[PDB]
């Protein structure tokens, strides 16, 4: 699909088979999602916004299908107020800018 | 111009005759740039990211050219690690996203 940028362009995710509301965001190189009980190893790490940093989890290879699209990869977890799709996932179903 | 996101999508703006590399960024709302000069009032506010809340300045109505596209609208300065393209300005330039 196209999504304009009239508002936040939210989308529908499912990780474990659990569906979210997430942000596609060009913006960011890594993908944040809210707090959640993820099952398996992770690695404790640090990113930086606009603010400052923020810990999070590093959870490796965890499955989550964007709008459809099915994707792989690392998902870090942590107290964001959105949960954020970038663009180590964005590329993998093929999301481009365009004007 | 189609731009992929196996790098940041970085372009170059043009804004009070100066030339800055920025980031199009669909997740911000706003656009936020570094330290500048720029002409006319500005208000304080105070805007919210992944790391918490920092101090800008307003600017509206400030034209900038961003990859060669017209865009005049409001501007925030203020300490941010990299210039952000928001939706306000992304719109105005045309600015989908796709996949
Ligand atoms: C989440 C993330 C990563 O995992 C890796 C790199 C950057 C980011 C990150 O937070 N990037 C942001 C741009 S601000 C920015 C800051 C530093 C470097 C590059 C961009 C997001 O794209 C936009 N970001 C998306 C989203 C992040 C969670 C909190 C609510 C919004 C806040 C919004 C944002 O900050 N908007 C402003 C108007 C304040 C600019």
Redesign the interface.
């Known amino acids: 699909?196209?999504?304009?940028?009239?508002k936040?362009?939210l989308v529908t995710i499912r990780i474990g088979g659990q569906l979210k509301e997430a942000?596609?965001?060009?913006?960011?190189?890594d993908t944040?999602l809210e707090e959640m009980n993820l099952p398996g190893k992770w690695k404790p790490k640090m990113?930086?916004?606009?603010?400052?940093?923020?810990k999070v989890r590093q959870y490796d290879q965890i499955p989550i299908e964007i709008?459809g699209?099915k994707a792989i990869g690392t998902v870090l977890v942590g107290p964001?107020p959105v949960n954020?799709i970038g663009?180590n996932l964005?590329?993998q179903?093929?999301?481009?800018?365009?004007?």
Chains 1, 2 share one sequence.
Do not use: E, K
């Not at 179903?93 to 004007?99: M, V």
């Open positions: 699909p196209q999504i304009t940028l009239w936040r362009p942000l596609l965001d060009t913006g960011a190189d944040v990113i930086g916004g606009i603010g400052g940093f923020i709008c699209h964001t954020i663009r964005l590329t179903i093929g999301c481009t800018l365009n004007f």
